[PDB]
Design a protein around this ligand. Structure first.
Ligand SMILES: COc1ccc2c3c1O[C@H]1C[C@@H](O)C=C[C@@]31CCN(CCCCCCN1C(=O)c3ccccc3S1(=O)=O)C2
Ligand SMILES: COc1ccc2c3c1O[C@H]1C[C@@H](O)C=C[C@@]31CCN(CCCCCCN1C(=O)c3ccccc3S1(=O)=O)C2
Ligand SMILES: *[C@@H]1O[C@H](CO)[C@@H](O[C@@H]2O[C@H](CO)[C@@H](O)[C@H](O)[C@H]2NC(C)=O)[C@H](O)[C@H]1NC(C)=O
Ligand SMILES: *[C@@H]1O[C@H](CO)[C@@H](O[C@@H]2O[C@H](CO)[C@@H](O)[C@H](O)[C@H]2NC(C)=O)[C@H](O)[C@H]1NC(C)=O
Ligand SMILES: *[C@@H]1O[C@H](CO)[C@@H](O)[C@H](O)[C@H]1NC(C)=O
Ligand SMILES: *[C@@H]1O[C@H](CO)[C@@H](O)[C@H](O)[C@H]1NC(C)=O
Lengths: 532, 532
């Protein structure tokens, strides 16, 4: 039967799922690691022991333990990101959508969800892989990994809580895909990993880490880069935060052993309840437990790895959204609200800048403010609001990606860059937030092809184009259809630095995406902060 | 007779001079101080002893000893600034143009020439006061003062060479005007001092200095401000330069007495020949001997005087030209030439920045470069050339004047600000230099009314308008004709910061002249340089 697949780990039984008037097979909740529970909490993952009999893979698995957004109860804009299955530490599973009839050896795409490294689920409606698998005829896999303290608590020097275990969870899933996807009709030689935000940072981290490079062929990064200021911490900062978490739970702090044992006796929600108390600064776009530059998963500093070409050389397709910072200003910066136009006073602007670049001294804060203030009209509320939106997006997402892009292209084998700037007609968030962080995902996953979701005919066309760009790239290392008549997405080169806009209008090519601001963020400001 | 005037210093005999088909009286070369020669070189000026008989004031006097421009022999663009009379240390004289018939008590305007404090003459053709005196019916005076080491060599603590004596020369001339102008038909209660560049800085210095304030009524500053970075030095830097001058002439440096005596035995040209060797940095727009913050002529730092309102409160009219920096880039920055379009490479741009802000550390240089580089088109030669032109003009002239303007207006009784941006049709300098430092002077002095000088009919109209604005302001403290139908030059206020463009097009009002760049130069950069 089509729904029965024998893998190196044992037999698995899937389910037939309807998709746009047709059908495909889905193998949901396949285990790829032993549950990281009890004494294994904080530890590197262990491979799942093979099983006898047939594993029932007809339903989604549990989501990993995580902080749950309750800022807007019942609001779909925020709840579409919350776990939609019961949470459990026993959450290391992957999902596979397979075209029907089962292919023999086709293109494989593995999705890595985002969520600031503290949240996320592979089972969200926006990550439903059936549309992409069906429309592009690819085997679509979505993995999972531990987030928050469970996946990133780091006490460097200890083997009980070394840090980066969430990344190792992702690596283990990629190993399982490499070893077994052939049985589902996928070609292990042609695996593209793709993810957004923390998932995009993760993809870049696998490109960098020597121990992950051989597990995939190509990569797609959406609104995320390994060098993002929020994506990693030093082992000293990781240690300080782990100790501070312990201090919040009245743990014995005499030794790592004492600390870890105490943290292991706590129920999941006890760690989550105090997780946010360990941040070193009053800030926005900063998360507690994230990857650590350990000297193992990451051999040396990310910057030196990027500068020396110490990373997997292959093709990459990546990009950013127009208003990456709005989600974060709404949730923490003074003056912003979901139900107002959020025009920002000069003082709230100043407060926002301080929260946005928490690590900056006063000279640094002045540099940023000057760079984003129109002094001919400084009390303009809309300009202050949009300026902050740009500060947050440029600093945390766009400029780090542009730095990654330029460093990468020097050694890589092919780069395609995009600027997604279409605001969905059915967006439930207010207009001031614009093209929000995370909102290109629904187009990548084909949601607009579903009539009941209320997208326009051009948005469905945009979705189909993006899906075919992503899949063709996964398949060939080039998003363009060979011998096609359609407009060509040009290669991003060190010299011309071309990129295309991604929206419902006829393709348009540009060059040097936000160079003015990124020279400020990537070259000048760090020089200023390092000198003063 | 109309050409005979009895003053408190003795009788003076002038000459009748033709002016635009009519005539007026001119009293040229009237002495206002004893010749500052021999043992009086470097000393404060002494008032001229009264004379018996009649002083022949029919011809221009000698010009003060100064460096002479030989960069373009025979070229009128540069030679129109060079002394046009024999040079001599016996050069403290003033000139007066009086309408005919002699008025009884009319508006007085006293001109203070510029020249970077190291050069300048009251006898230049562009400073001919007959047109303005005739057309506006004002008594026009042009004074003179020692420049270079002769007027500004400063060994603070010494009475033989205290510094600032060139400013005291100007003050003595203003005292003579106050005491005697009534005999020429001028009203001592209504004296307006006006000057350009170093002369404009001088005017602002008299506004600041307690010992000069009572000598005039109102002020006009053209492309110059007392706080300009090149207009003054500390007593320590003044001393170092004086000692270095001595070192260049093989002087005994054991004491001030030994140094000064040696400097006094040298012929004028010997000091001038090594004058430029004392600058502390490789730079442009920096001059050797300038005013010193001595604690006497200037009670405290210029900034604290400006901040506390420690200055004469009255009305001021001032402004800048569009391309203040071009003259200086042509003469010293790599890549610029008089006969080429001077498109600047990225490297010459960098070299220019270093010469333009000689006091800046590397972080400072990077800040400036970033602020003026279009990173989307950084190898554009015209943009690099124009960017440097703006760097030089903003830093040395425009932003210091804007800082002066805003500090002044808070305590003053009326401010009128202009932006002169008309390029004369008959300019002999190349097009790339634009509206050059010093080139609004010919319009202020009415040269365009002289047919043989080849100006257009609209330029003559512009000249007449400017002359009437200046004179009406001198007379009333307001450039606008009361009850006129013409467009009104609005008052510059702390709140609205309005200014007008000055050109052949219908008046246009704007606000916050070059605010973006001036916040950089007046607030951010000094904060950066002071911290790092
Ligand atoms: C690094 O990028 C991200 C960081 C956080 C999240 C996402 C994300 O990318 C997006 C798209 C996708 O990748 C998944 C989740 C998304 C959207 C949903 N949500 C958006 C709200 C994030 C901003 C508020 C975060 N919070 C705090 O900073 C904070 C501080 C103290 C206590 C509680 C909180 S919080 O959870 O409200 C969480
Ligand atoms: C502070 O503003 C200024 C500084 C210098 C001058 C003027 C001026 O404003 C204008 C208009 C008016 O006020 C009178 C003279 C003006 C035009 C004529 N000339 C223009 C040429 C100035 C630029 C070159 C100065 N030189 C040097 O920096 C240098 C260095 C070493 C040796 C020799 C020289 S230099 O004389 O060629 C001299
Ligand atoms: C990606 O790598 C391939 C193979 O290494 C590059 O193709 C080679 O290009 C070189 C230089 O032009 C030729 O000498 C070889 O014959 C090519 N090999 C093959 C098998 O095609 C390709 O140019 C690279 N692409 C980019 C954008 O770097
Ligand atoms: C310049 O100073 C004059 C006189 O000090 C100001 O005129 C006075 O304005 C105050 C306040 O409006 C009135 O109470 C007086 O009656 C006015 N005095 C006279 C004699 O007019 C004038 O407003 C000031 N101008 C500016 C721009 O500051
Ligand atoms: C597979 O497991 C799910 C768990 O709820 C169950 O509903 C479904 O009927 C099961 N099917 C088989 C054949 O075990
Ligand atoms: C005034 O002095 C000048 C000096 O050259 C002379 O030419 C002129 O004739 C003199 N006039 C009288 C009356 O002395």
């Amino acid at each position: 039967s089509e729904l029965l697949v024998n893998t190196k780990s044992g037999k698995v039984m899937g389910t037939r799922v309807p998709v746009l008037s047709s059908h495909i097979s889905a193998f949901l909740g396949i285990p790829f690691a032993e549950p990281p529970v009890g004494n294994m909490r904080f530890r590197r993952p262990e491979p799942k022991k093979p099983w006898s009999g047939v594993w029932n893979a007809s339903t989604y698995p549990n989501n990993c333990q995580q902080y749950v957004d309750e800022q807007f109860p019942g609001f779909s804009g925020s709840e579409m990101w919350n776990p939609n299955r019961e949470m459990s530490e026993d959450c290391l599973y992957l999902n596979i959508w397979v075209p029907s009839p089962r292919p023999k050896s086709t293109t494989v795409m593995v999705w890595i969800y985002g969520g600031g490294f503290y949240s996320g689920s592979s089972t969200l409606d926006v990550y439903n892989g059936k549309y992409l698998a069906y429309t592009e005829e690819v085997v679509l896999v979505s993995l999972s990994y531990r987030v928050g303290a469970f996946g990133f608590l780091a006490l460097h020097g200890s083997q009980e809580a070394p840090g980066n275990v969430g990344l190792l969870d992702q690596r283990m899933a990629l190993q399982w895909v490499h070893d077994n996807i052939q049985f589902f009709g996928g070609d292990p030689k042609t695996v593209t990993i793709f993810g957004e935000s923390a998932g995009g940072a993760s993809v870049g981290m696998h490109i960098l880490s020597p121990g992950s490079r051989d597990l995939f062929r190509r990569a797609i990064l959406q609104s995320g880069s390994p060098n993002c200021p929020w994506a990693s911490v030093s082992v000293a900062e990781g240690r300080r935060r782990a100790v501070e978490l312990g201090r919040n739970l009245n743990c014995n702090l005499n030794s790592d052993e004492e600390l870890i044992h105490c943290l292991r006796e706590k129920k999941p929600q006890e760690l989550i309840d105090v997780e946010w108390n360990v941040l070193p600064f009053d800030s926005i776009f900063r998360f507690s437990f994230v990857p650590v530059i350990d000297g193992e998963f990451f051999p040396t500093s990310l910057e030196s790895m990027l500068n020396s070409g110490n990373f997997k050389k292959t093709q990459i397709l990546l990009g950013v959204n127009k208003d990456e910072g709005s989600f974060f200003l709404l949730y923490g910066a003074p003056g912003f609200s979901k139900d107002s136009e959020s025009k920002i006073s000069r003082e709230d602007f100043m407060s926002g800048v301080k929260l946005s670049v928490p690590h900056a001294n006063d000279l640094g804060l002045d540099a940023v403010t000057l760079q984003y203030t129109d002094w001919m009209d400084d009390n303009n509320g809309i300009k202050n609001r949009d300026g902050l939106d740009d500060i947050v997006g440029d600093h945390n997402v766009i400029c780090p990606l542009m730095h990654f892009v330029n460093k990468y292209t020097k050694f890589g084998n092919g780069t395609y860059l995009y600027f997604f700037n279409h605001r969905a007609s059915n967006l439930v968030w207010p207009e001031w937030m614009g093209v929000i962080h995370g909102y290109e995902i629904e187009f990548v996953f084909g949601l607009p092809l579903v009539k009941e979701l209320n997208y326009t005919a051009e948005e469905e066309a945009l979705s189909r184009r993006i899906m075919h760009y992503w899949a063709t790239f996964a398949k060939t290392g080039n998003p363009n259809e060979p011998h096609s008549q359609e407009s060509k997405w040009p290669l991003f080169t060190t010299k011309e630095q071309k990129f295309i806009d991604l929206n419902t209008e006829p393709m348009k090519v540009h060059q040097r995406l936000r160079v003015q601001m990124c020279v400020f963020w990537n070259q000048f400001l760090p020089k200023l902060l390092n000198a003063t």
